[PDB]
Design a protein around this nucleic acid. Structure first.
Ligand SMILES: [Zn+2]
Lengths: 100, 64, 54, 191, 213
RNA sequence: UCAACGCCGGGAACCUCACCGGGGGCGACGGCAAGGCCAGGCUGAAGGUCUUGCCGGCGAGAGGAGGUGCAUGGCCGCCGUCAGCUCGUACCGUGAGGCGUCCACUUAAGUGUGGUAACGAGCGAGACCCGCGCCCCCAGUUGCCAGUCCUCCCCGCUGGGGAGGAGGCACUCUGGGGGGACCGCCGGCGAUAAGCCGGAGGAAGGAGCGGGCGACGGUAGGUCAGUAUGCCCCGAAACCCCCGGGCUACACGCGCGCUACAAUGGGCGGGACAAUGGGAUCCGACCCCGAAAGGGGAAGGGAAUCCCCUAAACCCGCCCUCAGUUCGGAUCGCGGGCUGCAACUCGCCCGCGUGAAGCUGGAAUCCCUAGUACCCGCGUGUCAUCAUCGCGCGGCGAAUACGU
């Protein structure tokens, strides 16, 4: 009877946006939500050598891509889904919803 | 080095030339006054300015 | 005649992976489905979203 | 899983951007944007002379997903506003000038004034190569303000690079512009 | 084997390792009194907290300093007893447990053989192994080998290093153990026997210094 | 030479490949059928080519891991994490040029306080960005289990100890937003200025700690063998494909390392204790085979849910007691396996045997100021298989100086 929402993004602006949206929805309406819950940030590190040749002292570039993760549970009302599915979902955010 | 730099010292002297008695000999009051009066977004610069102003006030008030 | 012109479909080895930008063979970043040489990755990383963060 | 096709998308976007930067050079290329609607791929192409893009557009629409494999692509063509603040198009403009046969001091000073007129706090152009004879040299023309080092360097400044191909060889053009809507940390304004 | 009342030892009073007191110990050199820490403790382990501060070593218990000296490999880049002592994989480097136990056994042996407090023994040994030296000074262009006095803290460092090196010497590639060697060194230096590396080098250093006065 | 030599991410079985031996393809554009194949033969093997027939109706451009890094672009190292490098107006000089940018004190710093033919500006330093450590607010799943309730099991002495599943977000942790440190207080030393050393208090004390971004310039420094490019050169070829060899060859001189020359130890059996990261024909718990390496099934997991994962050094007891040994472990024989189209040249693991130099090292020389150095193991990159390497992670944890 509860629906679970997973949010993933490289930017926190869109995340704050979507989460405040869902909070306003579930507060103006009568329906319960647990969260939002911050999951551990997932970072991808790629370390490579600068030089295109083999001469000179060796120096290394450390490149890092960060991914933030949020979780919510929304209680799965009918108006809930109808008013949640139609929200501005920018392109820098990935959303996945499932049932329990 | 604990050497306060150009704009720090200049802004202190200017905010002091103006609004003179709105500052006193306590770092906390001076800090919040600086925050009120200036458009600064970092705490380190604010605190250094406030400390320099405390020193200015001490020396002016009770000496040269 | 027309057969001795195309390469076999290797499954493993240095000769089974190219760089889609430069065409090199050897030193290819293999990490997370990416197929780019170190040079090309170091050139186009920010346009993919990587940063300093050091 | 996650990054397999996340990075797939990033890589293909970069490669298509490159193909287009190379095939839309006469028009003035400024960028790209992709959004896969449920109907198909929305493909926004910026430019400064949209007329050049337009049966060319048909050949693009087809070749794109004939070779790289998009699905249901349809292309839009916008026009950049204030193109004299984008270092990319300015670099390509100057390279095309030098290829036409104008002298480099003239071209550089012209571009500098034409950029600084329409609004800018600072500009820097660097030319490198065989400018005077068969031994190579480098020369810079600058004006105004810049932030060569630090984070604001990446955050605020626009940078561009291009290659001029003459009968003798390659000349490298580097451009860097600062916009007027900027401000630095120590640049305070006192109440 | 160790008996159980020694393998599982529980202290009740504040005492070095729970066994040996300090109130009956008395220093006599007025130069070294203020640098010989005799505070009542149970565990001499400071976890490297007093290194940054210049004179922070006067707050460390003598036993902890000795343990840290004993925690060594021997003699690299210099010869001691005639020869390099390089172990490099069978050394107790960054292993304070073993040095703790070595010092404990040595103290037990000392108590057994002397019927006194090993801390008093060690104190007298330091007093007798601390040298009161020469260096090179330029009075303008020209340089002379001169004789200069020494400070208490460097005296202590010297004495402790020399005791530990004497033990490492007498335990080198021989049937003797490190604890027995350390006990021998300490007793010898405390009763002023030339059998001791430390007393020997003290006398040699003062001898040379006397020349170049 | 520093700034070459575990460097070209260069751990090469085929490929990589650029080298050697031998084969087979290859004429965009332009004007004077091509090709597909049953059987047999040449051939390492091949409609590659010959017998057999049947079907089918000349110069350039491309390309080049070919030459030139002394024709270039872009990128990288070094001077150097150095504090330096320029401009306007005025003034001094016939002029090249000078001043400013100098003197005194002062900082990690052309960083600042005063004086002065200079007055004012600019780039760099700083400011800026990331992480560590302390406190507050918000949040409670896939993370946590203290206090609460119910079951179940065990011990000795009913007093203790464990396992579930309810139910909770107290604690830990996770991650967003805020606070906190400023020579601020007090002592001294300093021109009464800029500032220096110390004491408390405090999570933290003197740009708190550690990193990223490295100015104007120059080095004919390196890279055309990463891609791009001017000139020069190679068309049945230096172009494009397949087979086999080689880069793994060894009288020797060098750099960087691994293992040791033993008791500050070797072996056997018992007892403990992490973090970083990664994971679809991938990680693989759990069961069964096997002495070992390994084999057969297979839950779950797209990763706060499952897995890689009960690390070693350390502690306890027993044997060895200063010996070329129960140190050391190279070299060689027989056998058993994995990956892979293929393991001889030229892979990795397991068992039983074999048992070489080496007894602390001259002249000379390297790295290191604190959670640093020494010691110990692990992850990841490369990767079908292969780590004495690079990039990182935690465990145990000092000695000396606060100088010239
Ligand atoms: Zn590439």
């Amino acid at each position: 009877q509860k629906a679970r929402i997973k949010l993933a993004s490289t930017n926190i602006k869109a995340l704050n946006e979507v989460t405040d949206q869902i909070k306003q929805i579930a507060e103006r309406t009568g329906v319960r939500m647990s969260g939002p819950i911050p999951l551990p940030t997932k970072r991808i590190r790629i370390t490579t050598r600068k030089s295109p040749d083999g001469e000179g002292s060796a120096t290394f570039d450390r490149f890092e891509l960060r991914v933030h993760k949020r979780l919510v549970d929304i209680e799965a009302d009918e108006r809930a889904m109808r008013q949640i599915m139609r929200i501005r979902v920018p392109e820098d955010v990935t959303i996945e919803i499932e049932l329990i | 080095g604990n050497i306060k730099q150009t704009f720090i010292k200049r802004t202190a002297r200017e905010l002091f030339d103006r609004y003179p008695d709105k500052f006193t000999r306590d770092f906390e009051h001076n800090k919040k006054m600086v925050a009120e009066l200036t458009n600064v977004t970092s705490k380190t610069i604010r605190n250094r300015i406030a400390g320099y102003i405390t020193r200015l006030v001490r020396m002016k008030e009770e000496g040269k | 005649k027309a057969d001795y012109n195309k390469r076999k479909p290797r499954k493993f080895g240095k000769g089974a992976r190219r760089c889609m930008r430069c065409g090199q063979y050897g030193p290819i970043i293999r990490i997370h489905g990416l197929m780019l040489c170190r040079h090309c990755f170091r050139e186009v990383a920010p346009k993919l979203g990587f940063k300093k963060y050091e | 899983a996650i990054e397999r096709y996340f990075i797939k998308e990033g890589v293909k976007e970069m490669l298509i951007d490159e193909f287009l930067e190379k095939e839309l050079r006469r028009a003035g290329y400024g960028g790209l944007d992709i959004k896969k609607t449920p109907l198909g791929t929305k493909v926004t192409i910026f430019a400064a002379n949209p007329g050049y893009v337009i049966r060319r557009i048909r050949e693009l629409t087809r070749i794109l997903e004939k070779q790289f494999g998009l699905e249901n692509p349809q292309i839009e063509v916008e026009e950049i506003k204030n193109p004299y603040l984008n270092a990319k198009v300015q670099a390509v403009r100057l390279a095309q000038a030098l290829e036409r046969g104008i002298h480099f001091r003239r071209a550089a000073y012209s571009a500098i004034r034409a950029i600084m007129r329409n609004g800018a706090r600072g500009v820097e152009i660097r030319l490198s190569g065989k400018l005077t004879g068969e031994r190579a040299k480098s020369v810079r023309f600058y004006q105004g303000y810049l932030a060569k080092v630090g984070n604001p360097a990446e955050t605020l400044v626009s940078r561009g690079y291009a290659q001029a191909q003459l009968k003798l060889g390659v000349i490298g053009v580097k451009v860097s512009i600062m916009p007027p809507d900027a401000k630095l940390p120590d640049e305070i304004e006192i109440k | 084997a160790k008996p159980l009342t020694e393998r599982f030892f529980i202290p009740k009073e504040v005492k070095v390792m729970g066994r040996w007191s300090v109130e009956d110990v008395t220093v006599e050199d007025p130069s070294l009194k203020p640098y010989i820490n005799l505070d009542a403790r149970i565990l001499p382990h400071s976890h490297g907290r007093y290194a940054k501060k210049p004179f922070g070593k006067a707050n460390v218990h003598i036993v902890e300093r000795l343990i840290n000296k004993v925690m060594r490999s021997g003699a690299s880049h210099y010869k001691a007893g005639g020869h390099f002592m390089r172990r490099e994989h069978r050394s107790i480097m960054s292993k304070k447990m073993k040095a703790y136990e070595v010092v404990k056994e040595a103290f037990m042996i000392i108590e057994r053989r002397t019927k006194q407090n090993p801390i008093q023994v060690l104190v007298k040994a330091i007093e007798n192994s601390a040298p009161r030296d020469t260096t090179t000074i330029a009075f303008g262009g020209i340089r002379y080998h001169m004789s200069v006095d020494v400070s208490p803290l460097r005296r202590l460092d010297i004495a402790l290093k020399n005791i530990a090196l004497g033990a490492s010497i007498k335990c080198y590639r021989n049937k003797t153990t490190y604890a027995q060697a350390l006990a021998e060194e300490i007793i010898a230096a405390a009763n002023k026997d030339p059998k001791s590396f430390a007393y020997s080098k003290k006398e040699e250093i003062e001898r040379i210094a006397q020349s170049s006065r």
